[PDB]
Amino acid sequence: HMCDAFVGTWKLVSSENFDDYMKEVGVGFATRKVAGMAKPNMIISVNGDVITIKSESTFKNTEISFILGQEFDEVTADDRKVKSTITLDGGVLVHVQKWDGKSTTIKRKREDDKLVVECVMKGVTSTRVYERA
Ligand SMILES: Cc1ccc(O[C@@H](CCCCOc2ccc(Cl)cc2)C(=O)O)cc1
């Protein structure tokens, strides 16, 4: 029942500062423009210990499955090859991606009827808000 309140189908309804986050990450111009336009559907499900998070959009359909605390290899939507570890900290899913001596952290939290996604790369934060689909 560890992630019950995350499970479901969610749709992006707002984004703030995502271009700057993507610049900080190293995303190039064309990908920033097209990916920044995307309005993804996030689908979260749990089966036993395995959590699956799908992101479906006009830009790319991606999917990760993982066990909390157990590192995995992830190809991101911008084609970074990263090592990822996702944990639960105080009811917040904390997703750290490592690559090329760099790190970014993505936090996902339930707040009221929303799922809030906070993306941090050094001093830059982007906040993306999802609501139930
Ligand atoms: C097509 C797409 C565009 C933006 C996305 O935002 C991520 C927020 C979490 C960031 C994950 O890693 C990145 C970093 C940069 C880009 Cl351009 C896409 C994903 C989200 O909303 O789940 C997802 C998908």
PDB file of C-alpha atoms and ligand atoms in Angstrom:
ATOM      1  CA  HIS A   1       0.000   0.000   0.000  1.00  0.00           C
ATOM      2  CA  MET A   2       3.243   2.031  -0.043  1.00  0.00           C
ATOM      3  CA  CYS A   3       2.360   4.177  -3.026  1.00  0.00           C
ATOM      4  CA  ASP A   4      -1.411   3.928  -3.080  1.00  0.00           C
ATOM      5  CA  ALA A   5      -2.110   7.615  -3.366  1.00  0.00           C
ATOM      6  CA  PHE A   6       0.245   7.856  -6.445  1.00  0.00           C
ATOM      7  CA  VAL A   7      -1.431   5.074  -8.409  1.00  0.00           C
ATOM      8  CA  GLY A   8      -3.525   6.114 -11.368  1.00  0.00           C
ATOM      9  CA  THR A   9      -3.553   8.069 -14.600  1.00  0.00           C
ATOM     10  CA  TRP A  10      -2.493  11.697 -14.417  1.00  0.00           C
ATOM     11  CA  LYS A  11      -2.395  14.552 -16.947  1.00  0.00           C
ATOM     12  CA  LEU A  12      -0.023  17.587 -16.980  1.00  0.00           C
ATOM     13  CA  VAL A  13      -1.797  20.787 -16.248  1.00  0.00           C
ATOM     14  CA  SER A  14       0.959  23.315 -15.506  1.00  0.00           C
ATOM     15  CA  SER A  15       4.675  23.758 -15.797  1.00  0.00           C
ATOM     16  CA  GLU A  16       7.034  26.414 -14.507  1.00  0.00           C
ATOM     17  CA  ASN A  17      10.699  26.999 -15.312  1.00  0.00           C
ATOM     18  CA  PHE A  18      11.074  23.762 -17.314  1.00  0.00           C
ATOM     19  CA  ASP A  19      13.075  25.361 -20.139  1.00  0.00           C
ATOM     20  CA  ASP A  20      15.673  26.551 -17.652  1.00  0.00           C
ATOM     21  CA  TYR A  21      15.757  23.152 -15.951  1.00  0.00           C
ATOM     22  CA  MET A  22      16.306  21.472 -19.329  1.00  0.00           C
ATOM     23  CA  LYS A  23      19.117  23.990 -20.159  1.00  0.00           C
ATOM     24  CA  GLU A  24      20.763  23.187 -16.819  1.00  0.00           C
ATOM     25  CA  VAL A  25      20.539  19.466 -17.620  1.00  0.00           C
ATOM     26  CA  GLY A  26      22.160  20.031 -21.026  1.00  0.00           C
ATOM     27  CA  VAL A  27      19.220  19.486 -23.318  1.00  0.00           C
ATOM     28  CA  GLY A  28      19.713  21.018 -26.794  1.00  0.00           C
ATOM     29  CA  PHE A  29      17.542  23.619 -28.430  1.00  0.00           C
ATOM     30  CA  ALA A  30      15.289  21.456 -30.640  1.00  0.00           C
ATOM     31  CA  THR A  31      14.536  18.906 -27.959  1.00  0.00           C
ATOM     32  CA  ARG A  32      13.814  21.681 -25.441  1.00  0.00           C
ATOM     33  CA  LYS A  33      11.298  23.315 -27.748  1.00  0.00           C
ATOM     34  CA  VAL A  34       9.432  20.093 -28.697  1.00  0.00           C
ATOM     35  CA  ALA A  35       9.651  18.420 -25.275  1.00  0.00           C
ATOM     36  CA  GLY A  36       8.614  21.649 -23.569  1.00  0.00           C
ATOM     37  CA  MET A  37       5.441  21.608 -25.635  1.00  0.00           C
ATOM     38  CA  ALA A  38       4.480  18.093 -24.503  1.00  0.00           C
ATOM     39  CA  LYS A  39       1.508  17.501 -22.246  1.00  0.00           C
ATOM     40  CA  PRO A  40       2.296  14.032 -20.904  1.00  0.00           C
ATOM     41  CA  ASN A  41      -0.032  11.421 -19.391  1.00  0.00           C
ATOM     42  CA  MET A  42       1.762   9.830 -16.360  1.00  0.00           C
ATOM     43  CA  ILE A  43       0.485   6.313 -15.458  1.00  0.00           C
ATOM     44  CA  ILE A  44       1.610   4.906 -12.134  1.00  0.00           C
ATOM     45  CA  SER A  45       0.914   1.313 -11.066  1.00  0.00           C
ATOM     46  CA  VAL A  46       2.182  -1.083  -8.424  1.00  0.00           C
ATOM     47  CA  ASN A  47       2.383  -4.897  -8.554  1.00  0.00           C
ATOM     48  CA  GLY A  48       3.931  -6.344  -5.414  1.00  0.00           C
ATOM     49  CA  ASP A  49       7.214  -4.533  -4.836  1.00  0.00           C
ATOM     50  CA  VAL A  50       7.473  -3.342  -8.434  1.00  0.00           C
ATOM     51  CA  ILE A  51       6.443   0.220  -9.240  1.00  0.00           C
ATOM     52  CA  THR A  52       5.879   1.163 -12.924  1.00  0.00           C
ATOM     53  CA  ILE A  53       5.787   4.769 -14.127  1.00  0.00           C
ATOM     54  CA  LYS A  54       4.859   5.405 -17.772  1.00  0.00           C
ATOM     55  CA  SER A  55       5.005   8.798 -19.495  1.00  0.00           C
ATOM     56  CA  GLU A  56       2.998   8.991 -22.693  1.00  0.00           C
ATOM     57  CA  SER A  57       3.117  12.068 -24.921  1.00  0.00           C
ATOM     58  CA  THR A  58       3.372  13.231 -28.510  1.00  0.00           C
ATOM     59  CA  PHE A  59       7.138  13.520 -28.079  1.00  0.00           C
ATOM     60  CA  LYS A  60       7.989  10.092 -26.619  1.00  0.00           C
ATOM     61  CA  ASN A  61       6.401   7.162 -24.734  1.00  0.00           C
ATOM     62  CA  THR A  62       8.733   6.024 -21.927  1.00  0.00           C
ATOM     63  CA  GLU A  63       8.400   3.546 -19.066  1.00  0.00           C
ATOM     64  CA  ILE A  64      10.392   2.627 -15.971  1.00  0.00           C
ATOM     65  CA  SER A  65       9.819  -0.236 -13.556  1.00  0.00           C
ATOM     66  CA  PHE A  66      11.776  -0.433 -10.313  1.00  0.00           C
ATOM     67  CA  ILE A  67      11.966  -1.497  -6.711  1.00  0.00           C
ATOM     68  CA  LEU A  68      12.477   1.206  -4.114  1.00  0.00           C
ATOM     69  CA  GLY A  69      16.112   1.638  -3.154  1.00  0.00           C
ATOM     70  CA  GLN A  70      17.443  -0.581  -5.996  1.00  0.00           C
ATOM     71  CA  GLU A  71      19.413   1.196  -8.726  1.00  0.00           C
ATOM     72  CA  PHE A  72      18.529   0.702 -12.360  1.00  0.00           C
ATOM     73  CA  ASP A  73      19.657   1.936 -15.795  1.00  0.00           C
ATOM     74  CA  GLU A  74      17.243   4.461 -17.432  1.00  0.00           C
ATOM     75  CA  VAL A  75      17.250   6.109 -20.873  1.00  0.00           C
ATOM     76  CA  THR A  76      15.571   9.472 -20.416  1.00  0.00           C
ATOM     77  CA  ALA A  77      13.304  11.188 -22.887  1.00  0.00           C
ATOM     78  CA  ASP A  78      16.311  13.384 -23.962  1.00  0.00           C
ATOM     79  CA  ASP A  79      18.489  10.262 -24.484  1.00  0.00           C
ATOM     80  CA  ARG A  80      20.640  10.526 -21.441  1.00  0.00           C
ATOM     81  CA  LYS A  81      21.843   7.136 -20.210  1.00  0.00           C
ATOM     82  CA  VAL A  82      21.539   7.462 -16.475  1.00  0.00           C
ATOM     83  CA  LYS A  83      21.756   5.384 -13.311  1.00  0.00           C
ATOM     84  CA  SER A  84      18.606   5.953 -11.277  1.00  0.00           C
ATOM     85  CA  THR A  85      17.591   5.195  -7.729  1.00  0.00           C
ATOM     86  CA  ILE A  86      14.047   5.895  -6.416  1.00  0.00           C
ATOM     87  CA  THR A  87      13.208   5.898  -2.744  1.00  0.00           C
ATOM     88  CA  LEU A  88      10.258   6.948  -0.516  1.00  0.00           C
ATOM     89  CA  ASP A  89      11.236   9.744   1.987  1.00  0.00           C
ATOM     90  CA  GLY A  90       8.478  10.832   4.190  1.00  0.00           C
ATOM     91  CA  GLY A  91       5.806   9.997   1.663  1.00  0.00           C
ATOM     92  CA  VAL A  92       7.692  11.715  -1.276  1.00  0.00           C
ATOM     93  CA  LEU A  93       9.053   9.645  -4.133  1.00  0.00           C
ATOM     94  CA  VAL A  94      12.671  10.794  -4.609  1.00  0.00           C
ATOM     95  CA  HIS A  95      14.263   9.902  -7.974  1.00  0.00           C
ATOM     96  CA  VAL A  96      17.973  10.603  -8.410  1.00  0.00           C
ATOM     97  CA  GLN A  97      19.576  10.293 -11.881  1.00  0.00           C
ATOM     98  CA  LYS A  98      23.390  10.119 -12.190  1.00  0.00           C
ATOM     99  CA  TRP A  99      25.338  10.476 -15.418  1.00  0.00           C
ATOM    100  CA  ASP A 100      28.667  11.941 -16.546  1.00  0.00           C
ATOM    101  CA  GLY A 101      29.560  13.072 -12.993  1.00  0.00           C
ATOM    102  CA  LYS A 102      26.201  15.026 -12.917  1.00  0.00           C
ATOM    103  CA  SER A 103      23.062  14.539 -10.847  1.00  0.00           C
ATOM    104  CA  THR A 104      19.450  15.610 -10.978  1.00  0.00           C
ATOM    105  CA  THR A 105      16.679  14.921  -8.469  1.00  0.00           C
ATOM    106  CA  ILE A 106      12.975  14.570  -9.307  1.00  0.00           C
ATOM    107  CA  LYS A 107      10.516  14.582  -6.384  1.00  0.00           C
ATOM    108  CA  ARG A 108       6.901  13.458  -6.783  1.00  0.00           C
ATOM    109  CA  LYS A 109       4.392  14.297  -4.015  1.00  0.00           C
ATOM    110  CA  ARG A 110       0.628  14.208  -3.523  1.00  0.00           C
ATOM    111  CA  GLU A 111      -0.740  17.639  -2.577  1.00  0.00           C
ATOM    112  CA  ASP A 112      -4.511  17.968  -2.402  1.00  0.00           C
ATOM    113  CA  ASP A 113      -5.868  16.371  -5.594  1.00  0.00           C
ATOM    114  CA  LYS A 114      -2.633  16.979  -7.499  1.00  0.00           C
ATOM    115  CA  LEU A 115       0.601  15.123  -8.047  1.00  0.00           C
ATOM    116  CA  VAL A 116       3.400  17.718  -7.970  1.00  0.00           C
ATOM    117  CA  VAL A 117       6.700  16.953  -9.722  1.00  0.00           C
ATOM    118  CA  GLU A 118       9.718  19.051  -8.669  1.00  0.00           C
ATOM    119  CA  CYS A 119      12.825  18.758 -10.842  1.00  0.00           C
ATOM    120  CA  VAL A 120      16.142  20.149  -9.573  1.00  0.00           C
ATOM    121  CA  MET A 121      19.461  20.511 -11.460  1.00  0.00           C
ATOM    122  CA  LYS A 122      21.996  22.498  -9.288  1.00  0.00           C
ATOM    123  CA  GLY A 123      20.332  25.851  -8.428  1.00  0.00           C
ATOM    124  CA  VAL A 124      17.447  25.423 -10.897  1.00  0.00           C
ATOM    125  CA  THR A 125      13.986  24.040 -10.006  1.00  0.00           C
ATOM    126  CA  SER A 126      11.040  23.350 -12.203  1.00  0.00           C
ATOM    127  CA  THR A 127       7.586  22.546 -10.867  1.00  0.00           C
ATOM    128  CA  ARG A 128       5.137  20.483 -12.961  1.00  0.00           C
ATOM    129  CA  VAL A 129       1.607  19.831 -11.724  1.00  0.00           C
ATOM    130  CA  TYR A 130      -0.517  16.839 -12.712  1.00  0.00           C
ATOM    131  CA  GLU A 131      -4.198  16.162 -12.011  1.00  0.00           C
ATOM    132  CA  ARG A 132      -6.202  12.955 -12.358  1.00  0.00           C
ATOM    133  CA  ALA A 133      -7.059  12.124 -15.971  1.00  0.00           C
TER     134      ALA A 133
HETATM  135  C1  LIG B   1       8.115  14.453 -23.056  1.00  0.00           C
HETATM  136  C2  LIG B   1       8.312  14.856 -21.639  1.00  0.00           C
HETATM  137  C3  LIG B   1       8.596  16.184 -21.347  1.00  0.00           C
HETATM  138  C4  LIG B   1       8.792  16.575 -20.060  1.00  0.00           C
HETATM  139  C5  LIG B   1       8.720  15.671 -19.001  1.00  0.00           C
HETATM  140  O1  LIG B   1       8.992  16.162 -17.757  1.00  0.00           O
HETATM  141  C6  LIG B   1       8.991  15.327 -16.679  1.00  0.00           C
HETATM  142  C7  LIG B   1       9.535  15.998 -15.446  1.00  0.00           C
HETATM  143  C8  LIG B   1      10.603  15.161 -14.824  1.00  0.00           C
HETATM  144  C9  LIG B   1      11.934  15.338 -15.627  1.00  0.00           C
HETATM  145  C10 LIG B   1      12.568  14.108 -16.258  1.00  0.00           C
HETATM  146  O2  LIG B   1      13.680  14.145 -17.140  1.00  0.00           O
HETATM  147  C11 LIG B   1      13.570  14.944 -18.298  1.00  0.00           C
HETATM  148  C12 LIG B   1      14.461  15.950 -18.441  1.00  0.00           C
HETATM  149  C13 LIG B   1      14.319  16.724 -19.542  1.00  0.00           C
HETATM  150  C14 LIG B   1      13.353  16.448 -20.503  1.00  0.00           C
HETATM  151 CL1  LIG B   1      13.258  17.482 -21.890  1.00  0.00          CL
HETATM  152  C15 LIG B   1      12.418  15.420 -20.338  1.00  0.00           C
HETATM  153  C16 LIG B   1      12.563  14.659 -19.188  1.00  0.00           C
HETATM  154  C17 LIG B   1       7.564  14.932 -16.251  1.00  0.00           C
HETATM  155  O3  LIG B   1       6.646  15.778 -16.390  1.00  0.00           O
HETATM  156  O4  LIG B   1       7.299  13.771 -15.813  1.00  0.00           O
HETATM  157  C18 LIG B   1       8.364  14.343 -19.244  1.00  0.00           C
HETATM  158  C19 LIG B   1       8.213  13.947 -20.556  1.00  0.00           C
END
